[PDB]
Amino acid sequence: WKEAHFQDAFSSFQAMYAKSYATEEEKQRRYAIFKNNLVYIHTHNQQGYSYSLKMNHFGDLSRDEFRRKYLGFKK
């Protein structure tokens, strides 16, 4: 895909989940994470697994951010 495809995909993501960003630095970081996740999902779904992946409201989070705030089991 070209950059414009990723750019369109991120705008749709922003619209669909009402994601906005308080700084241009945050938006560029979140765009980069989003692109990386999007590529991951697309590649994964070509590999013939028993399960599929799909973009969702965690699309602009890295694994570390996801783990730190969106889980919560502490033994």
Next chain:
Amino acid sequence: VLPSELPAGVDWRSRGCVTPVKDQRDCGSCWAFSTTGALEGAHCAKTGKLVSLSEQELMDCSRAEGNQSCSGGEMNDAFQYVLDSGGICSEDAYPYLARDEECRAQSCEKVVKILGFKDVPRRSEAAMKAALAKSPVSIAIEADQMPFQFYHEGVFDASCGTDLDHGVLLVGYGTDKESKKDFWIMKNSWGTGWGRDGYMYMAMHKGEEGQCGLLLDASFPVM
């Protein structure tokens, strides 16, 4: 106890004992959702009545038992609170805000109560099936890996870690002819836009620890 004596499948959803999928949002409150789901299911299994219960109460009011609201917690400490405090309020009475706040449990009626809580015997699929025959079961898993973050549908048989960091609920089990794999039916708390309308079909035969560690720290309320 004999496996023949267990049903081929169990799904508490189609028995009417599972509330709609909920969403913890950006708060480390999964433990509270796993707890309320187990209590909703156990109460309904016993009485035939499904009452949606308060995660926020658990978050706000169970710090004495070891839980830390959006900073994390565990299901057994939450069951202990429910036992300690004489029960839990309804979701409607004490709704979910996804934020830390002071306890207001004087503000509502305790609608569901427990006698105690039990751990599922460890590292046994048969023991988990037997528990699920009785009611939904609270489980802890590692849920931070990318395939987990973006899971959509199908039997999730991904190579999974066992660093337990998320608390969810099993509501049954069955078998998938598409992938030819047996599964557990898991209910998450990340809303209906994640997974299969909020659910995940987890591979059943992934060794003694369970898929993503689900046989390591499973428990349920006794009513």
